[model samples]
Target chain A: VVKRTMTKKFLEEAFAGESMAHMRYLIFAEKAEQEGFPNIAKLFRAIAYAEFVHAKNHFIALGKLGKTPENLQMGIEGETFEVEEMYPVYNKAAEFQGEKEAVRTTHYALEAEKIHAELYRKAKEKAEKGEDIEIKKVYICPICGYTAVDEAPEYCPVCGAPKEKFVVFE
Target chain B: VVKRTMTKKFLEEAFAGESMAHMRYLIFAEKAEQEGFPNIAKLFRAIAYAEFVHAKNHFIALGKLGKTPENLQMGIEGETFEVEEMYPVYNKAAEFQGEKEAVRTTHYALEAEKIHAELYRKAKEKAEKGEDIEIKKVYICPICGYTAVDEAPEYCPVCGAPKEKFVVFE
Candidate 1:
C-alpha cells in the first residue's frame, strides 16, 4: 500500500490528466489520418485507448462512485461549480489577459454547463424516485457542447453549429 | 458549413467538456456497481461511450491533426506549457488559496509533465528522422500520471503509487 498522507487528490489529478491525454491523442490521430500517415494514426489511437484505461483505473481506485441518485447529484454539483464559480473566475482572468480564444472557450463552457446543471438536477429527481429520466434522445453540439434532451435547436445556441452537427445519443 | 469567423475554439471546448464527461460517467458507473445497481452502471457506461463519440466528432471537426513529426512537436509544446506555465500559475494560486488538494494536484502534474515534455521531444526527433521511437512498453502510474518509457518505478515519484498500480501500454 502506498501512503503519502492518504491524499486522494492525486488520483483525481491522474484521472484528469489521463482523460485530457486520451482526447488530445485522438485529435492528433485525426491529423495523422488527414496527412495520410495511417500507421501514425493507429499509434495515436492505441495510446489514446491506453490513456483511457489508465484514467478508468485511477477512477476506480478513488472509490467515490455512488448510486444513480447520488451520482446524478454529484454531476449536478460539478456542473454548478463550473457554471457558477470555476468558469466565472477563469473567464474574468482570461478577459483581463486579453486571451480571445480563452475567453471564447470559457464563455461557451459557462453557457453549456448552466444547461447541464439543470439537466442533472432533473435527472437526480427522477433517479431519486427510482426512475430514469424520460428522453427520446440526447443531442450534443459538436462545436459548443450545447445539450438538448430530446430535440436539438436549428442552430447551436452557443456556437451556431447546425442541427446536422448535433451528435445524437439514444 | 459553419462559419462565425471560424472560431475553432468552440470545437476545442466541446472536445474538452465531452472528454471530461466521459471520464466522469465512468467513475459514476463504478460507484453504481458498488451500490449493486447494475442497470444504473450500464446506463452510465452507455452515456460515457456516447460522450466519447461526441468528443471524437468534435476533435475531427477541428482538423488540426498533423503528420507524426508535427504532432509530436505539438505534443511537446503542450507538455512544456503545462510544466512551465499552466501548472506553475495554477499551483501558486492553489497554494495562496490554501487549497491543499489543488496544490497537491498541480504539484503532481507539474512533475509528471516535466518528464513528458522531454519524452515528446525525443519522440519528435525520431519522428522527424522518419523513424518510430523504440519502446518495449510504456507504463503510467494510476495515481499520479508518472510515465515510464519501458518500465515502471517501484513507486510513483510524484504520488507514491506502487509498481503494481502502474498501468502498462504495449
Candidate 2:
C-alpha cells in the first residue's frame, strides 16, 4: 500500500479550498445581481469560472483523478459518503458552533452531491457499456444545487423554483 | 455618479475565478471520499474552506461589498437580472449550442437568483425596520437546488424529490 504522503495530502486539501472558492463566488454573484449590480454579478461569474480552471489544475496535480470508469466509481462513492456521512456530521458541528456560513456551505454541497452521484452513475453505465455519454446540456439550480440533465424542469421539485431559476452551462 | 474603472473590474473578475476554484475542490474531496480516500477528502475540504477565505479577501479588495441596505438592494437587482434576462439568454444559447454544463450553470443561477432576491428583499425590509432576522435549521433539496426556511418539505416542490433527499443546515 502506498502510504499517505504529506505532499499528496497537501495537494488534495488545496484542491478542496480552490473548489470551495469557485462555487462561493457564483452564489455571491446572484447576491450582487439582485442588488442591481450587473457589473459585479458579471464580474463574479467571469472571475469565478477562472477559479474553476485553477481548481481543475490543482485536482489534476493531486493525482486522485483516475481512468474514466474509475473516476465515475469514485464519484459515486464520494457522493454517497457526503449524502450519508460527511455532510451530516459537518452540519451538526456547524450548527453546534452557530456558524451559519458553515452550515450553509455543508447544506449546499450536501444537496449537490446526491445529483452528482446519479450523474456519475449514468456516466459509469456508459463507460461500462464502452459507450460515450450523450448528455448535451446540464442545468444547475444555484439555490438548492439541483442539477438536471438536458432539459430543466419548469419548477425545481426540490425547491419549487421555476425553470428560469436554473443556471445553464455548455 | 460613479463609473466603474478597469482596474476595479479586473479585481472583481479575478475574485470570481478564485471563488470558483474554491468550490471545485470540495466536490473533488467528496470524489476522493467515495474512493475510500477519506484523507484526501479531509485534505480537500479543510484546504478548500481556506481557499474560500482567500477568495473573500479578493472580494473585499475589489471594494464592491457595500453597506447592508446597499448590498441588499444590489443583490435583489442582480438576482432579478439573472432570472429575467441573463439566464434566459444563456439557456437559449446553450440549447442552441448543445452545451449541458452551460445550461446547468445558467439554470441553476436562475432559480437561485429568485430565492436570493426574495431573501435579500426580506433582509432589506428588516434593515429598514432596524431588526435582524431569525432562523434555525435551513433545509435544502439536493436534487433541485430548492431551499427552505426552518424546515424542509416532505417533498421538494421544485424537483419533486422526496424529503429524504433533503439536506439540512442550522
Top-TM-score structure, candidate number = 1
Report model 1's chain A TM-score: 0.86
What shift in Å separates residue A23 of candidate 2 from its native position after superposition? 6.5
Instruction: List RMSD in Å for every model shown.
Output: 7.9, 18.4
Question: Which lDDT tens digits does candidate 2 get at residues A1-170?
Answer: 11235434433443444354445555566665665555445544543443354445445544555645675576577568767886677566656655554455556556656666676677667656655566555676655556676788888776577899776653
lDDT of 2 at A158: 61
Per-prediction backbone clash count: 2, 96
Q: What ranges in model 2 sit over 4 Å off?
A: A1-170, B1-6, B98-109
lDDT of 1: 0.66
RMSD of 2: 18.4
Residue A34 of model 2, lDDT score:
67
Per-residue lDDT tens digits of candidate 2, residues B40-98?
34434443443354345445444555655665575567667656875577556655655
Q: Tell how far residue B112 is off in model 2, in angstroms.
A: 3.5
